[model samples]
Target: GPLGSMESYWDCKGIPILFRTVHAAVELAFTSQPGSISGYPSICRTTPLRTGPDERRQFPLTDTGARWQGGGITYYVEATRDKRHCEVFGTAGGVYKCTLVLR
Candidate 1:
């Protein structure tokens, strides 16, 4: 099957990703599909991360990064052109890793 959008891919493949609640901070990294106009940051937060619907932050894939902060929680995303690596840190002092694969 073909993925209609990045939100669709996240909704389908991100079901198993969950984190312990704490400060509710998230940082994700992924390689954007080559020349892909649709992109999303894979997020699983204690407060949960979503754009209310099928909306995701779109950015140009490069060495650049983006950050979102609110309610004492922060989200950092790195837009890379290759590889998958993510790190989430909690206020209670815990760390977890997540991986994202794009095709």
Candidate 2:
């Protein structure tokens, strides 16, 4: 019963939060400029790239019956011999990623 109720509640509330957070994070990751970054903390190396009202609205708060419906928060970290990046998604499911630049 608890699991069912939690699932139902997630479908109603949690999902939306996840979606919004992930969307935000994505916007923040891709829209970074040559010098300016947007999503993650200012002190951090990462920056935000793209963000807009329309993009923000891409993930609706309504249930769409998808397993990850309402948008669940997901994350990806990329690292290589030369480059490294960190990303984090928000409550609304917005994600932010940035290449770690050491100065």
Candidate 3:
């Protein structure tokens, strides 16, 4: 999982977490430190996901709009939009949006 150690993006809030670059500087921003001690890249922002059934779909990882990233991860995924692995829950919000599954 590109999220690495991140068991789930949403903490039951159903919010779509924008996994951006981060620095492992702060002590409590995460339950587990990822990447490196610093400049390893962390959470950028968290947003609410769409709850419309029409918006719900399976993210094949190829579609940029279907998935999302960190610096190193961004490079790999950006290069291959649909080749990698982890798929998404699509618009299945309410504790399930923007979350990745072990495809």
Candidate 4:
């Protein structure tokens, strides 16, 4: 069977990640490394997920209000009021909010 995955946008942070089903592993690409190494990208600061023991390793694309912790911080994603994008946020605080690129 095919896995559930889709491209995501992080315009505010200048990087990209794959918004995937909770059963799949989260994916991140450095490509050009975006802004700079001095500051980590919104999701880049977090450790990439490894397959867990019957534990969810990824976030759901269709659902909102899910959270995960990484790099000593908590992060979450939720649907925008406009229903056009899934907004990502960090607990520490920042302006960058990852937007989902729904097809």
Best by TM-score: 4
Supply candidate 2's per-residue lDDT for 14: 28
Model 1 Cα lDDT, one tens digit per residue, 15-90? 3212221111122223333223233444333333354432222221211122332223222232222212223322
Badly placed stretches (over 4 Å) of model 3 are 1-31, 34-36, 51-103
Cα displacement (Å) at residue 64, model 4: 20
Model 2 worst lDDT window (10 residues) = 52-61
Candidates ranked by lDDT, best first? 4, 2, 1, 3
lDDT of 4 by residue, 1-103 (tens): 8885545543224334335522121321122132232232223224333642221121222133132322243344433222233455443356345554554
- The per-residue C-alpha lDDT of model 4 at residue 88 equals 56
What TM-score against the true fold does each predicted structure earn? Answer: 0.22, 0.21, 0.17, 0.28
Q: Show pairs that collide, candidate 1.
A: none
Sort by TM-score, top down from the best: 4, 1, 2, 3
Q: Which is the leading candidate under lDDT?
A: 4
Model 3 poorest 10 in a row by lDDT:
74-83
lDDT of each prediction vs. the true structure? 0.26, 0.29, 0.26, 0.34
